[PDB]
Structures are given as structure tokens and as C-alpha cells.
Amino acid sequence: FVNQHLCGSHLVEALYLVCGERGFFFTPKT
Amino acid sequence: GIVEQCCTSICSLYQLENYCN
């Protein structure tokens, strides 16, 4: 069934979208 | 944090938004 989890590169892309001009901090597990 | 909340579990928009700068 469709997956709602946001992981890895998909998670940092989500932050890129939602944060917009505010930016963000992130730490990859990889 | 964000991986447990949004990758292991499922998170909502304002949970995500709270991680922004």
C-alpha cells in the first residue's frame, strides 16, 4: 500500500519545500 | 527527532515545520 514515511533524501527534500526561505538544519544518518 | 517522527513513524505538516530555522 502507499507509503507515508519520509526517509533519507525524501525527508531533506520535504524540509527544503516546507522551510522555503527560512532554511533549516539537518543531519543525515548516512 | 525528525527521523523517528517522520521516517520511522508518520508526521504532520506542523511537526515538520517546527524543524525549520
Side-chain angles (χ1 to χ4, degrees), chain A residues 1-12 14-20 22-30, chain B:
Chain A
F1 202 72
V2 67
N3 191 336
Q4 305 306 331
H5 303 283
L6 294 173
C7 299
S9 75
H10 297 315
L11 184 56
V12 76
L15 287 174
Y16 168 75
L17 179 57
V18 306
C19 301
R22 301 190 152 74
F24 59 94
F25 185 83
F26 186 75
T27 312
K29 297 285 182 188
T30 48
Chain B
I2 192 172
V3 172
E4 285 284 349
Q5 195 177 237
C6 296
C7 174
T8 299
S9 301
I10 299 164
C11 67
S12 69
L13 179 65
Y14 286 161
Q15 291 176 325
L16 197 62
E17 288 181 358
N18 272 317
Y19 295 110
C20 300
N21 248 104

